[PDB]
Design a protein around this nucleic acid. Sequence first.
RNA 1: GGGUGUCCGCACUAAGUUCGGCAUCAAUAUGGUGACCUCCCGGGAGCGGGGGACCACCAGGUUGCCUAAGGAGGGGUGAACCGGCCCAGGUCGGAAACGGAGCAGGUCAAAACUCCCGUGCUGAUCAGUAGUGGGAUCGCGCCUA
Lengths: 47, 197, 108
Amino acid sequence: KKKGKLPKNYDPKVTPDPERWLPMRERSYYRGRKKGKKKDQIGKGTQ
Amino acid sequence: HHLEILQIIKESQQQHGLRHGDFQRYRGYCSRRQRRLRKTLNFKMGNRHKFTGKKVTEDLLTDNRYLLLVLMDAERAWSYAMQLKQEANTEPRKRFHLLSRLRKAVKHAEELERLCESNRVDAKTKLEAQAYTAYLSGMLRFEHQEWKAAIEAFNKCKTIYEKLASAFTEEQAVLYNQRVEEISPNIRYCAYNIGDQ
Amino acid sequence: DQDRFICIYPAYLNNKKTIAEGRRIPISKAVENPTATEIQDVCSAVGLNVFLEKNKMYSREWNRDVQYRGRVRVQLKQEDGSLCLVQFPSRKSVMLYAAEMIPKLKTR
RNA sequence: GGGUGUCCGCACUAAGUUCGGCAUCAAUAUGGUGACCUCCCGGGAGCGGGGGACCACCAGGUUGCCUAAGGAGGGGUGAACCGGCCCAGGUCGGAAACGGAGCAGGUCAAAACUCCCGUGCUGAUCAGUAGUGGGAUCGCGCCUA
Ligand SMILES: [K+]
Ligand SMILES: [K+]
Ligand SMILES: [K+]
Ligand SMILES: [K+]
Ligand SMILES: [K+]
Ligand SMILES: [Mg+2]
Ligand SMILES: [Mg+2]
Ligand SMILES: [Mg+2]
Ligand SMILES: [Mg+2]
Ligand SMILES: [Mg+2]
Ligand SMILES: [Mg+2]
Ligand SMILES: [Mg+2]
Ligand SMILES: [Mg+2]
Ligand SMILES: [Mg+2]
Ligand SMILES: [Mg+2]
Ligand SMILES: [Mg+2]
Ligand SMILES: [Mg+2]
Ligand SMILES: [Mg+2]
Ligand SMILES: [Mg+2]
Ligand SMILES: [Mg+2]
Ligand SMILES: [Mg+2]
Ligand SMILES: [Mg+2]
Ligand SMILES: [Mg+2]
Ligand SMILES: [Mg+2]
Ligand SMILES: [Mg+2]
Ligand SMILES: [Mg+2]
Ligand SMILES: [Mg+2]
Ligand SMILES: [Mg+2]
Ligand SMILES: [Mg+2]
Ligand SMILES: [Mg+2]
Ligand SMILES: [Mg+2]
Ligand SMILES: [Mg+2]
Ligand SMILES: [Mg+2]
Ligand SMILES: [Mg+2]
């Protein structure tokens, strides 16, 4: 219930995105993390 | 501080094949484990295109975790040797490779014993390593049929493991009593080869 | 007794030839490119019935050149088996003598 | 009410999967094979009989104060002419019997190339399985009078 406070919980429109928590690739923001993967691949690979 | 060597080897071997006698598999797991330990601890022997000697110095010995690495070198050799002893019944030149390995197995244990001479390691691990080195010295100097040195190392080994067994619970003592019972027949064989003259 | 003379071909003494090539004496003692002409001159000079066959060549000599051309014949024994000279009782000894003297003629 | 899963650019550990770079130690006793060297014996030549020293390749018997390892591994393939062997012709020695250096021609592949198995060190790989944790928690299950 901490919710990083809770006033705001009802203040910006009552709740977070209804998709909310669930698979992050599944949500409707729908980001698939391209250049961040690529930056992390290249990072791990090169050592 | 601590390290229950005999227990490590017995359970590892029992889990990864020697229960049905697969020295080739156990050597394999022993190798894979060294690879995991090395990759985790960022302690690499060789970077692509060059090789560097791994020296397990005294500092990193605080980790009570690195000794296992050398112990795995020693177990790897020892396993390969027994594997050859099985392949030599039909290839006798294999015997020569066998002896080479046991010698390195003993060499690792002696260096490993040297590591446990550090003031950073507890008495119980010093005795476990002394007993391990004595034991391999014994198996080598047994395959050379050099009975007096073999019985010297086995009596050193028996005396040490008996010292450890008399100090703790009979429940934990069971393993140590099992090692002495485990090498007793070689002891009797050594005696019968000495008292022949 | 013409046709029972022993044979000496140049190659037996040519130090720049090998044993498979016909050499019979140690390299230390042989000499460079000795010729049949030179061998005859030394053996007639020491008192041996010798004659030069300018027209005979050693089978083992591939080079068809004057320096390798030649065969020298030496009479070693009389019909009754006795030595012509006690000093040269065998083929080997003749070869060695040839090699010893050859450098003194016109090498200078 | 609590605990816990459902959530994350999370973390540690352990057993795994898939895949690329590099590297592959020697000393010997003995036997076979080839070259050179060096001794004898016999012959009128060609040459015939035999003895040692040493080099390099194979085998493979005993060994290690050589290791990060380093086996006496396998597969494809691989032939000049300044390699071996068989050498018509021809040439040289021979009276001949035949023999020598050997062209042309045909011919034979040990090595080196190369791909693995084995062994060692690597560098990664999986929107990853298991176990213990962390941040997170309105929604949703499950466990608790
Ligand atoms: K083949
Ligand atoms: K040819
Ligand atoms: K011919
Ligand atoms: K021949
Ligand atoms: K929750
Ligand atoms: Mg055991
Ligand atoms: Mg060996
Ligand atoms: Mg022995
Ligand atoms: Mg979130
Ligand atoms: Mg060496
Ligand atoms: Mg040598
Ligand atoms: Mg040595
Ligand atoms: Mg050898
Ligand atoms: Mg043999
Ligand atoms: Mg002799
Ligand atoms: Mg001869
Ligand atoms: Mg001969
Ligand atoms: Mg092979
Ligand atoms: Mg293949
Ligand atoms: Mg060649
Ligand atoms: Mg043919
Ligand atoms: Mg002919
Ligand atoms: Mg003819
Ligand atoms: Mg003729
Ligand atoms: Mg012919
Ligand atoms: Mg023939
Ligand atoms: Mg040809
Ligand atoms: Mg490859
Ligand atoms: Mg194999
Ligand atoms: Mg969790
Ligand atoms: Mg959690
Ligand atoms: Mg976190
Ligand atoms: Mg976070
Ligand atoms: Mg909490």
